[PDB]
Amino acid sequence: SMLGERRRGLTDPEMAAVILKALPEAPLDGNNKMGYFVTPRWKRLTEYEALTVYAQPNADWIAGGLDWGDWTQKFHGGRPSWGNETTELRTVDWFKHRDPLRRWHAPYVKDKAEEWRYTDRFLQGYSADGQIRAMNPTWRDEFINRYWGAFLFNEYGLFNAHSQGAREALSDVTRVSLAFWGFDKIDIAQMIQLERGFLAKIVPGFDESTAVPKAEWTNGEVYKSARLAVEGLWQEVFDWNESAFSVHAVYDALFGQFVRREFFQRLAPRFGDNLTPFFINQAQTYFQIAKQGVQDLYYNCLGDDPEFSDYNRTVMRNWTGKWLEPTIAALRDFMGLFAKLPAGTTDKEEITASLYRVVDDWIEDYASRIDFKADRDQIVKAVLAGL
Template identity: 25%
Template sequence: MSEAQTTAEAHAKKFSGSNSRKFNYFEPKGRRATLYEDVTVDVQPDPERYLLQDWIISWADGKPAYAEEWTKIESSDWHAFRDPNGEWERNHYIRQSSIEKQVALTIESAQQEGVFQNIDKTWRKVIQDHFSASKHAEYGLGMVFLQAQRDGMSQMINNATLVNSSDKLRYAQDITLYLMDLAKDLKELNEDAGKENWLNNPVWQETRRVTESFAAINKDWAEQVFAVNLIFEPLVGELFRSGFIMQFAASHGDYVTPAIVSTAEADYERNLAYSVEMFNTFLSDPIYGDNNKNVTQEWMKKYVPMCVEAANQLQPIWSQPRVKVSTFSDAYNRAKERFNSILGQINIKIPEGVKL
């Protein structure tokens, strides 16, 4: 091989920006690439970006590792989405660790001060029957996002969805551990009551039906994210967490439960932010935006009535605490306003004929 050929081959193998301290193989969201972008963009390449030989791996039946057909949403650039939270493994682990320390210290302090013994008895029953039941919904949604995160068409999409899954599973676990601590101090508390209510109490059956239907969605990760974060959460999840637990607990001598629930509310604010950004990207796509709007309209026709029914079935819970801080009607009106504001953020409206 001649010297000229050897030199040419060496140049061909050399990455074009290898001598630069700047990343120039992708377009950053802002003026400069963030650390989040550096460690997520193109970690999952695809045949549209760099893979000349098609997907590196495929399923046993020959289907590719990732396929656009796994969602009805279409995109001219799956890599355009950036998580506004900029969350990746390191800062996610740090955040989760901080939350766990906060929860543990709150419970430990309450035990030392004998707080659990002073909680109103009607509220203890609510925690036992209904707060405990809610963990099954949270766990189920965590598993929905765990499924969805595998199928997204870019690492940025999958990262955000996986963080969402981790948040839900952590919160469900926090509820479980909290109830175990409560049971040590309150011997009459039945740790199995939550499961019984989740499976058989009529007030929870519509919520159960909705959450189980999300898991049954056939290979459409975008539908799962849209249905859970943009419909179910404001109309049902937040309704119970913020509209009930956060409103009623303090007046019944309980500051621990709201401290735990507040972590889930903060989680949702972050997960709502990425969901809004993701669907704004899809709905404003220069080629497929109109199609994607039609798809989301069909999803709303399917899931809004189910979530409205689930929310209304929870109404009897508001009458069970001794101190009536607010009504279900007030809480649900706030939930509807929240839902409408979320739709406004992605510039879509409730389909005609669909009522809240």
């Protein structure tokens, strides 16, 4: 019918009259701020904090917890739903962490959605504009299809490394940031395939199948050490913090930043490829976003913990050293790829310049935070010895 059969209390005269009659003269408490008891990181409580902080039902025996008592149901054996035993790191309050970008679900999917739609629009303009005409065939059919494509398995592997952390994270603020770090990773992997699917549509004989790039990743030599380090960070680490720290503050900050930025983002333009940089722009925008959250957690919170400052730095310095070697190896193997490039593409003077950028940026943003003493020259040297 026009009015419908269901009567709603907000508009139905009879029901609304009853509701109105039962209402108090004024609110029964003047404090209309949800999460008012949360300690603000900034000047005033943000929507991000109110809607996130303390959603996790931890009891006081998990630093920061506001609840009390044991869990209601545990694992066969006695392992707690969540517990201090799932990570070496210690703190005075696991809820201290704050994403500098203050991303809760809404803002997060809003930004990514904007990128998706602009991406579709970009591809539609690029194809209509015939920009593919100025791209080097060899760079396209060999380096983008095989080597860039192979890197999707690297980003995919880093994505998967987050699964356990998605389950073990000890606070809401940390779980949300973690999830978003991993989700951005699979997004990148998917954008790499997207580009290959795009090429297949506008370049007649281009094959989008992952057959080629996968074999390169699983059997190639260029990514051999890269794949080994990934397989380890993913399936050999059972500590959600070692996983997150080692991936974002060690491996991907070194190997990843070099491959994405110093190799494809730097050289693709020279082959008339503005297509790949379009997606790498997203991967880097994402990397820099995550970085702020990674820094706030492991440095601002743990590394500078009012009670476990020295302790955590020791563990992170330990971790930094533990995975810095597998990372150095990854870079070394990757150095072989240069020899495959056409003559005159680049010289050792350039690569050395890029390597120092990656390392100096690393020490500047990560290494010096936990007082890890790293030698830029020795590192660059050990890596540079792979050409």
